[PDB]
Amino acid sequence: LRQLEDHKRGEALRQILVNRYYSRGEMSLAEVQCHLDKEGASNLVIDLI
Amino acid sequence: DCLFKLCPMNRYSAQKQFWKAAKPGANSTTDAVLLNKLHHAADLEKKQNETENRKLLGTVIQYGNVIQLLHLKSNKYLTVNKRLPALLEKNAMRVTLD
Amino acid sequence: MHVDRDPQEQVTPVKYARLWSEIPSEIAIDDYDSSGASKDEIKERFAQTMEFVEEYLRDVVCQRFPFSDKEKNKLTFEVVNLARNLIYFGFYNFSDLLRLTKILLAILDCVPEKEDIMVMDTKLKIIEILQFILNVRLDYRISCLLCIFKREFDESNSQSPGALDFEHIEEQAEGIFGGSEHGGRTFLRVLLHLTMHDYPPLVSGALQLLFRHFSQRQEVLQAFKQVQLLVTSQDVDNYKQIKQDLDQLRSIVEKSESYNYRVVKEILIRLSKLCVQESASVRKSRKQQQRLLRNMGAHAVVLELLQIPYEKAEDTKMQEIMRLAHEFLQNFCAGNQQNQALLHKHINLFLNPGILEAVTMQHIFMNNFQLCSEINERVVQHFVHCIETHGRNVQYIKFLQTIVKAEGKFIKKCQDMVMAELVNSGEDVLVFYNDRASFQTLIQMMRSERDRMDENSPLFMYHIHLVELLAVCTEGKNVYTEIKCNSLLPLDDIVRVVTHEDCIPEVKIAYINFLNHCYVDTEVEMKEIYTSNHMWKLFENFLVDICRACNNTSDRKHADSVLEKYVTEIVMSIVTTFFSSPFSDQSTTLQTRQPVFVQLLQGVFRVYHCNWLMPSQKASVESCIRRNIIERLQDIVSALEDRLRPLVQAELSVLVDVLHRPELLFPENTDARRKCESGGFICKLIKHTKQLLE
């Protein structure tokens, strides 16, 4: 058990950090990309290339 | 002696492959199938190399392209090989005829 | 006026090259090794000043809660400039600037239009010192790490096991990094607030600080990997000149065009003098003590200089540096295989020239066995066509004498590597001689002048003097090819009579050792009898020359070497008593006994060693009647990098969560959040991202 215990302790550290640093909206790949394009993430790529 | 005939670029892709594979270095590897097909590919490459020379017959040339000089009375291109230095001036790059 | 740099200067807190003198002490942030700052002559002149800035900032956090732009900032800028300049000169303990920053962070979070430049500069200075405080807790954390490592290692020390150490690394990793209950949660809030702003260059520093707060474990692991370069507990300057010369080297590799050029030759001379490290000594207690110390990463720096960015290969300023750099690189790998195998991955740079860059391959392969036995089908076969088409190089021809040829008998599997060039070379570079080789060639070599005529460049005969390469590769014990080698060979029995026509000592030595290696090879040789009756004649007229040279009263050196070389022939396979090989008759037994005793007499009478005298007596008589912490730190950094997998989960997930967090009880008000959360935080983030390319 190598890749499972590491995942467990990583999830534990992540959860500890989340409740330390803290009506949440839904999330999906179909919405974050059009949100990033709405705020203009296309222009950053097309000017950085 | 001095006459040189101009030419276009000549692609050497399968010809160099055949010259590399036809010289037995250490293994002396020969093949009735691989070497025969390689020789056929080199011959076809030479034929399609020649068939575009007649296509590019009247065409001006600008400074910046490859020009491939050909000796007329010898039918022999003049080449510059990177490995071999000149015989007389021993810091140079020798020219030959191939 | 008070920071005029007369007694002091700015010192970075992340300094390297720790010692054994302060790490046995396990104390918290209250005390350090220096226990403060400089001596008691200057601290009292600033002690009454230090409380002033603290009282002023404690008043600022009291009654400047909304903001101030009414010339109070026209004093806070000067007081934080004074604070910043006193931080950089190291007049603080860690217990003081922590108190400064635990209240300094609270003065900003009490919440494209143009604004005031003055507060922009104030915020730039304070984020600069917030950038500094993260660079001093790194040194504390590294110090505590090797302190607890030393105390746990010496608790279970087996020297004047490691399993007890491994159960604590995860414990301290989960204790001192997380799992608490060091600004806290409000540290990131002011970072986000400063990031969401107008377009300064301040936001670049704030965002770099935000990325510096995260990704903390991998960077402390990398720093801890880099800082372990322990020395013999002095380090007064020993690493310092190497480091400042490397930094001097950093400015003379990319572009040499000319103030920078005049430094290169001097610094290469200095680096070579430091690298040779008293070669006339035992080369163990002085060379190896400092040999690992420039193996900190100073390997490819010289190679980047050697990567020839400039191509002016005429007679110019190339030769003033390249020969010296080559010599320094030869001194870099003359110690052992640790540097040799490390440089063995860069064998693609020294292929074509054969003049100056061939000395690297010439000298790097002295006596290794497990590195030069792994030669592929491309390295030694690169030089098969480089022997031709470039002349015969005397300097190069000693290289393949070392990589492949022999130490006695080297190996059998590389005989196909070294012998297949003879049939691949259609030019047949290995010729014997022409018909005029008697005096038209050999009268100029050493019959004219001695001392190798300014370092052995004749271009003609040493290419045939180095035929011991051809002689002993398969003639030791290999039964690979006997007919193939002997067919193109100079046909040994024929070439004897042109040797006796005119004798030359070096060519004679090469001929006798070639013949000795040929005869003692195998017992499956087909022809022996006419090789045995004719070697008697050369043995007789060579013992005549040995007796002639024996009259010299220790006034020669070639004869002694010749006698030693001929000693093995006497000690080689015994003679035969068949129809041929006449059994040492009157004409044969009268020269192999009486004249051999005198040969050994001169050596015994002279200062010659008895190592070769004994074989002559036995053969002549017989023939008549007939500091463990270096591995420990590597083990520790390996065990520390073993836990990198949960770090990715603990890092990337919290990053993508806090970038999905612009608004969650930030002050949870209304006026400061509808600008904050409108899909515009990432908008300003990527707007600043495209402006940082310049």
The count of C-alpha atoms lying within 13 angstroms of the C-alpha of B52, restricted to the half-sphere facing its C-beta, is 9
Q: In angstroms, rounded to a whole number, what is the distance separating the alpha carbons of residues A13 and C179? A: 8
The SS3 assignment for C671 reads coil
- The dihedral through the CA atoms of C452, C454, C456, C461 has a sign that is negative
Q: Please give the C-alpha separations between residue C228 and each of A44, B53, C138, C295, C629, in angstroms, as whole numbers.
A: 41, 67, 15, 12, 10
- The dihedral through the CA atoms of C649, C651, C657, C660 has a sign that is negative
Q: Which two tokens stand for residue C67?
A: 């903001």
- Answer for the pair C364, C339: CB distance below 8 angstroms, yes or no: no
C210: left (phi over 0), alpha (psi -120 to 50) or beta: alpha
- Cα C241 to the chain's mean position, in Å? 17
Q: Please give the C-alpha separations between residue C262 and each of B92, C318, C370, C584, in angstroms, as whole numbers.
A: 30, 13, 41, 73
**Which of C359, C380, C360 shows the shortest CA–CA distance to C422?**
C380
Q: In angstroms, rounded to a whole number, what is the distance separating the alpha carbons of residues C584 and C626? A: 9
| Residue B60 to chain C, least CA–CA distance (Å) | 34
Q: Please give the C-alpha separations between residue C382 and each of B25, C376, C470, C520, in angstroms, as whole numbers.
A: 12, 11, 18, 32
Q: Which two tokens stand for residue B53?
A: 């020379």
Q: In angstroms, rounded to a whole number, what is the distance separating the alpha carbons of residues C374 and C392? A: 27
Nearest to B25 among C389, C416, C424 (CB): C424
Q: Which residue has the tokens 């000017």?
A: A47
Residues C390, B26: C-beta atoms closer than 8 Å? no
CB atoms within 10 A of CB C46: 14
- Answer for the pair C503, C545: CB distance below 8 angstroms, yes or no: yes
- Answer for the pair C90, C11: CB distance below 8 angstroms, yes or no: yes
Give the start-end residues of each E strand in C162-268.
none
* DSSP string of C101-156, one letter each residue: HHHHGGGT--------HHHHHHHHHHHHHHHHHHHHHHHHHHHHHHHHHHHHHHHT
- Answer for the pair C524, C479: CB distance below 8 angstroms, yes or no: yes
- Answer for the pair C639, C166: CB distance below 8 angstroms, yes or no: yes
Give every CB contact of residue C93 below 8 A, 6+ residues apart in sequence: C32, C36, C37
Q: Closest residue of C to B28, CA-based?
A: C424
- Answer for the pair C133, C95: CB distance below 8 angstroms, yes or no: no
Q: Please give the C-alpha separations between residue C400 and each of C359, C396, C404, in angstroms, as whole numbers.
A: 12, 8, 6
C457 vs B: CB within 8 A: no
Interface test with C, best of B83, B84, B87 (most C CBs within 10 A): B83
Q: Rounded to 5 degrees, what are φ and ψ at C31?
A: -130, 160
CB contacts, 8 Å: C384 with chain B = 25
| Residue A30 to chain C, least CA–CA distance (Å) | 16
The A-side interface with C (CB below 8 A) comprises: 3, 6-7, 9-11, 13-14, 16-18, 20-22, 27, 35-36, 38-41, 43-44, 47-48
* DSSP string of C561-607, one letter each residue: HHHHHHHHHHTSS----SSSS--S-HHHHTTSSHHHHHHHHHHHHTT
Question: Which residues between 149 and 178 in chain C have a beta carbon less than 8 angstroms from any beta carbon of chain A?
Answer: 178
b/e per residue C637-661 (b: at least 16 CB within 10 A): beebeeeeebbebbbebbeeebeeb
Resolution (A): 3.3
Experimental method: cryo-EM
Q: Which residue has the tokens 């007229």?
A: C541
- Answer for the pair C478, C415: CB distance below 8 angstroms, yes or no: yes
Q: Pairing mode, if any, of strands B95-97 and B70-71?
A: unpaired
CB contacts, 8 Å: C648 with chain A = 10
Q: In angstroms, rounded to a whole number, what is the distance separating the alpha carbons of residues C184 and A17? A: 11
**Which of C506, C507, C489 shows the shortest CA–CA distance to C498?**
C507
CB atoms within 10 A of CB C477: 11
Q: Which two tokens stand for residue C79?
A: 């007081």
Q: Please give the C-alpha separations between residue C522 and each of C195, C404, C412, C479, C535, in angstroms, as whole numbers.
A: 83, 21, 14, 8, 17
- Cα torsion C414, C417, C420, C425 to 10°: value is -140
- Answer for the pair C9, C130: CB distance below 8 angstroms, yes or no: no
Give every CB contact of residue C72 below 8 A, 6+ residues apart in sequence: C64
The SS3 assignment for C95 reads helix
The SS3 assignment for A44 reads helix
The SS3 assignment for B77 reads strand
Q: At what angle do helices C117-155 and C73-88 cross, to 10 degrees?
A: 30
- Answer for the pair C137, C14: CB distance below 8 angstroms, yes or no: no
Residues C381, B25: C-beta atoms closer than 8 Å? yes
- The dihedral through the CA atoms of C453, C457, C459, C463 has a sign that is positive
Q: In angstroms, rounded to a whole number, what is the distance separating the alpha carbons of residues C233 and C231? A: 6
Nearest to B84 among C381, C384, C389 (CB): C389
- Cα C563 to the chain's mean position, in Å? 43
Q: In angstroms, rounded to a whole number, what is the distance separating the alpha carbons of residues C403 and C418? A: 10
Pairs from C198-205 (Cβ < 8 Å, separation ≥ 24):
C198/C112, C198/C113, C198/C115, C199/C112, C199/C687, C199/C688, C199/C691, C200/C120, C200/C124, C201/C124, C202/C120, C202/C123, C202/C124, C202/C127, C203/C688, C204/C688, C204/C692, C205/C124, C205/C127, C205/C128, C205/C131
- Answer for the pair C399, C361: CB distance below 8 angstroms, yes or no: yes
- Answer for the pair B69, B50: CB distance below 8 angstroms, yes or no: no
Nearest to C424 among B26, B84, B85 (CB): B26
* C389: DSSP letter: S
Instruction: Identify residue C394 by its one-letter amino acid code.
Output: V
| C631 marked as part of a ligand binding site | no
C554: left (phi over 0), alpha (psi -120 to 50) or beta: left
The Cα diameter of chain C in Å comes to: 126
Question: Which residues between 375 and 434 in chain C have a beta carbon less than 8 angstroms from any beta carbon of chain B?
Answer: 381, 384-385, 389-390, 416, 420, 423-424
* C382: DSSP letter: G
b/e per residue C558-568 (b: at least 16 CB within 10 A): ebbebbbbbbb
